[PDB]
Design a protein around this ligand. Structure first.
Ligand code: ZN
Ligand code: ZN
Ligand code: ZN
Ligand code: ZN
Ligand code: ZN
Ligand code: ZN
Ligand code: ZN
Ligand code: ZN
Lengths: 309, 74
């Protein structure tokens, strides 16, 4: 089976699983929308109403697609969706991991200029160590996240559900630490009593902060907002490994085919980016076929690998 | 509706049922209903992001059963 897409299934599975892509007409919400061209990249499926199509349901004027992902591991409802982790790829290029140097699959590909590749196991270790050391990055717009392990700029992970790789309890700690950092970012304080955990925005012009809040919100400890003691009177990556672990830049030793003959009429068709759904433009042919599998286009290829990176 | 948890930093989870189109403002009203904290005094934070009153849970990509943290502004 070729799987292009991964979700986190928080339901029966509690792990990163291959995902099934589905599409519907955004007007009638039925799986009756014929796309002009299939999705060729993540933005095509993540940005709602981006893609044009013609709805096949009687008299529906719908022309916009909405895509959803379900976990591929089990019979699901259409409405039992899972979150797509769009940085995760099948390692079709056999690119080595930036940290362990092994070829593994799946991998996560950072959005740095270098598109650095880390296996998911190393990604787990990266997240756990950074979390425990309080070296996650708090960003006022993006929230609590991490960049590329190599330290590349503009590479903070935007889809925070990737941190579900931590596992449920570590993810809860992730969100907790993110909340504390947000509080501090906002000019708040954390209660210093061991085991309390409260954070709050205190009143402006007072050095005395009390951990306020009935029904368990606070513990009533009064501390100095300066020194955080009880309120008191008076003064208080390997360079080569990183090079090799680049999704695009380290893949050029292998020829990338961009054109394949239509299986039916044998006339060459150009691939559109990462889209696997090929449409013969010959008017007497019009075969639709999967680039990857070679077979007539069908819903299995659609769900499993409509496009790839 | 969708079940979310509103979690105090001290670790108490408050279960709230929301419509996915409910504004964050409306979420705070639901918290007031259950906990008696005036919305004005609530800050809701999801994965480190301060949630704006005019956005919906769907704007923050929050899934069913997920946790928003609640912080008091005195
Ligand atoms: Zn599953
Ligand atoms: Zn329709
Ligand atoms: Zn690795
Ligand atoms: Zn990088
Ligand atoms: Zn306290
Ligand atoms: Zn002091
Ligand atoms: Zn053809
Ligand atoms: Zn296929």
């Amino acid at each position: 089976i070729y799987n292009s897409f991964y979700v986190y299934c928080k339901g029966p599975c509690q792990r990163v699983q291959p995902g099934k892509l589905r599409v519907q007409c955004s007007t009638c919400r039925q799986a009756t929308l014929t796309l002009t061209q299939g999705p060729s990249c993540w933005d095509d499926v993540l940005i709602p109403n981006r893609m044009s199509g013609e709805c096949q349901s009687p008299h529906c004027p719908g022309t916009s697609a909405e895509f959803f992902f379900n976990c591929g591991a089990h019979p699901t409802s259409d409405k039992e969706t899972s979150v797509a982790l769009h940085l995760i790829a099948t390692n079709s290029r056999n690119i080595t991991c930036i940290t362990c140097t092994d070829v593994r699959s799946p991998v996560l590909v950072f959005q740095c200029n270098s598109r650095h590749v880390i296996c998911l196991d190393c990604f787990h270790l990266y997240c756990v160590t950074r979390l425990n050391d309080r070296q996650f990055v708090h960003d006022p717009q993006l929230g609590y996240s991490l960049p590329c392990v190599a330290g590349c700029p503009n590479s903070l992970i935007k889809e925070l559900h990737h941190f579900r790789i931590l596992g449920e309890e570590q993810y809860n700690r992730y969100q907790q630490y993110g909340a504390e950092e947000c509080v501090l970012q906002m000019g708040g304080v954390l209660c210093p009593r061991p085991g309390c955990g409260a954070g709050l925005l205190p009143e402006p012009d007072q050095r005395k902060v009390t951990c306020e809040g009935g029904n368990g919100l606070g513990c009533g400890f009064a501390f100095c907002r300066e020194c955080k003691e009880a309120y008191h009177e008076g003064e208080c990556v390997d360079e080569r490994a990183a090079e090799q672990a680049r999704w695009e830049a380290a893949s050029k030793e292998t020829i990338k085919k961009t054109t394949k003959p239509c299986p039916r009429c044998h006339v060459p068709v150009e691939k559109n980016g990462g889209c696997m759904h090929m449409k013969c433009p010959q008017p007497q042919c019009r075969l639709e076929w999967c680039w990857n599998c070679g077979c007539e286009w069908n819903r299995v290829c659609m769900g499993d690998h409509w496009f790839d990176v | 509706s969708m079940l979310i948890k509103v979690k105090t930093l001290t670790g108490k989870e408050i279960e709230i049922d929301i419509e996915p189109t409910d504004k964050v403002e409306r979420i705070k009203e639901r918290v007031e209903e259950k906990e008696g904290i005036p919305p004005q005094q609530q800050r809701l934070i999801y994965s480190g992001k301060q949630m704006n009153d005019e956005k919906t849970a769907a704007d923050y990509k929050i899934l069913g059963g997920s946790v928003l943290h609640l912080v008091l502004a005195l």
